[model samples]
Target: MRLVEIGRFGAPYALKGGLRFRGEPVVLHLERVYVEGHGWRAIEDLYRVGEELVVHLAGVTDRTLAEALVGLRVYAEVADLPPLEEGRYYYFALIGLPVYVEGRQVGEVVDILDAGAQDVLIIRGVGERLRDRAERLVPLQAPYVRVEEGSIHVDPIPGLFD
Candidate 1:
């Protein structure tokens, strides 16, 4: 089964085994979640507190058990995700797509960096001397990017690639 990491377990929220997750509230619907060190377990309850999502695992009923899971990564099956509207995309879907600049192949997307104000695409070298370097960071926003046909099209500034 393919799993997508949707959040990370953070500090204990209360004395009653509630743990906070630093990610989208969509995790509320996650019936089963994978915890690092520990395998998949059923969720007993899930709810939101302001911006943080709190989770209660079936077996974890105390602060100590919840504290042990701090930093545990949470994963959900890819098929379990809700459908996205047109033009909207998950970061996982963007990774590995070929990237082109001015209709010329440049690289393939390897990762994405969330740089606060905006997100940047980390492209692995594909063609020409640019491949000498490990990768390039391209902004994922406006007037310069177009995602289509399983590829990312970029119109970078003159020295952007340099």
Candidate 2:
């Protein structure tokens, strides 16, 4: 099973074992989660306090143990997630895929920038020389972006790539 990072353990929430987690809210539904350098552990409890989400792992019973987990990344298996419909994609799968324009190879997607209004693709290596490597920012919205098998096809408007 493939695992994807979902969140990280932040600070201890209270004197008890509760830990502050900075990650997607959907992770609350995870029954089993893995901490980096640590194997899978059962989710003892989960809840939200204000804007932060708190989590309790089965063996974590005090603030000290919770604090030890701070900054540890959390991961869940891809098989544990619900399957997506055709033509849909998870951002994790799109990163590093090659990007093309009008059937010509341009570069690979290195990162996705999440602006408040829209998501943008960060393409790297569009330039020919090592010193000429350039980063292109393209919005990942419709009519301009399309995800095909094994690669991402983009059709940006004029001057967008300049």
Candidate 3:
């Protein structure tokens, strides 16, 4: 699914709609926002302050109305997402692709994290060869990743697989 619901409206803040996302480090640039059981609507405005998402819906006002939207999941269809620029990839596009090094199967991508500075990919199924033993958080950067055949081909650095 392209659109994933990370959080919902919690309370009002500074006369604007302040929301909390269930998913930690939730994304706020919603391409399409919707209320469960209701139809789709465009997000009016969204901003990120530290870890919180401050939003302003088209018609939502007051804490009571906003609170009703809590637990609602927002989504954006895969087709709705814009194309990535050269040398860049969206986290969703990398999901389910097998990771390889030197033409050998290493593992598949399970998740991607935007940890403050750069993106990190959590890879699974490579066994205990990596230092982490369970998952390898590979840095998503050029000279390490090349997009081919709808999958990411990574050339892992030394000690990353140690």
Candidate 4:
């Protein structure tokens, strides 16, 4: 449940089995990279070639070997990356997580928005309580809500979905 998509290999580059890296550059800093077909592999090196990122996995010895990941996306578990500073989380962590208000699920988080002053959760209303509204924007701040890992808890305000 904590898997974070770190990057994907585009084209094999260089003669040392380096692959073109796309997605979060933060990936280069992590260990235990996971490729669908390959599972976990130790990343050996990373190079910034001109404007593109070239990454080399330890077992991949040449350009031809790097081609192994072209069709797969890469992932890293949260514990494999930098540690969060208590109670904080990457916005994507909330995605696909259900939202609960007063013990009843109001919806599920579909996306998040950077609203300058604070971030907002875009919820896709589910259940009969939300029939009056299909979508709602909820601010991601304390008192209004609390994230319980598996699901987010919210303090209901009357007619909020109506």
The whole-model lDDT of each prediction reads: 0.79, 0.80, 0.64, 0.78
- Residue-level lDDT tens digits of model 1 in 66-140: 989999888777667777787677786567788888888887888899888988889887534656446678878
- C-alpha RMSD values across all candidates: 5.0, 4.1, 5.7, 3.0
The sequence of per-residue lDDT tens digits that candidate 4 reaches over residues 1-162 is 377666788999868888898877777677668887788888888879888988788899987788768968888876676767876777755777888888888788888887789888888975356454555878888577888757899887765644
TM-score rank, highest first?
Answer: 4, 2, 1, 3
Model 4 off-target regions past 4 Å?
Answer: 127-135
Clashing pairs in 1: none
Q: Once all C-alphas are superposed, what RMSD does model 2 give against the true structure? A: 4.1
In the range 2-96, model 2's lDDT, one tens digit per residue, is 67777899999987898999976768777988899999989989999889999999999999898889999998776776667875566764567
**Cα error of candidate 1 at position 17, Å:** 1.3
Q: How many residue pairs clash in each candidate?
A: 0, 0, 2, 1
Ranking by lDDT: 2, 1, 4, 3
Ten contiguous residues with the weakest lDDT in model 4: 126-135
Best candidate (score: lDDT): 2
